[PDB]
Copies of this chain bind each other. A is one copy, B any other.
Amino acid sequence: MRVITLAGSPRFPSRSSSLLEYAREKLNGLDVEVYHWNLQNFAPEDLLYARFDSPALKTFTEQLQQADGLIVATPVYKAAYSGALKTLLDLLPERALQGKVVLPLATGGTVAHLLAVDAALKPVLSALKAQEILHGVFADDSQVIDYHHRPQFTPNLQTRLDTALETFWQALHRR
């Protein structure tokens, strides 16, 4: 089993990337090979001006083709996913998530926003032909206690992340 993790935050490090470093620890223990990407791995001109001959884009698309699932994480901006994340999603092949399980993580100031962000992501991930979109998981900015070093999360948040990642693994393993 191989998994892609993608941080969609405009900053690095971020709350988004700290959630994915926690996920990679767990997935390392479950003998899942993880390819981890953030938006700062790409040339900004290639994202903003939608240039498909980016080197990194080819390597990302190759690793996505080999992946059984995707954990994608985004800050909540204007009641939706980040535009920074969407610039990369817009560069992927038309059926890039076919065959794959997707776990979406969202970070922000209030969980009241999760439903709107789930609803914004659904058509995009469905356009990419995701095989299985898991329910979105919200992490409150106040519960991500430190994101510059090894992640520190409140214990409620850890348990909720562990639970969602176990659902994700079971979803992959079933397939």
A residues apposed to B, CB below 8 Å: 10-11, 39-40, 44-45, 47-50, 77-80, 82-90, 92, 116, 119-120, 123-124, 126-128
Contacts and interface: CB of A to CB of B under 8 A. Distances in A.
B48 A44 contact: yes
Main secondary structure of the interface of A (DSSP, over half): helix
Q: 6 tightest A-B contacts by CB?
A: A83-B86, A83-B87, A10-B50, A44-B48, A44-B44, A79-B127
B86 A10 contact: no
7 contacts: A10-B49, A10-B50, A44-B47, A50-B82, A78-B124, A83-B84, A120-B120
A169 to B, nearest CB: 27
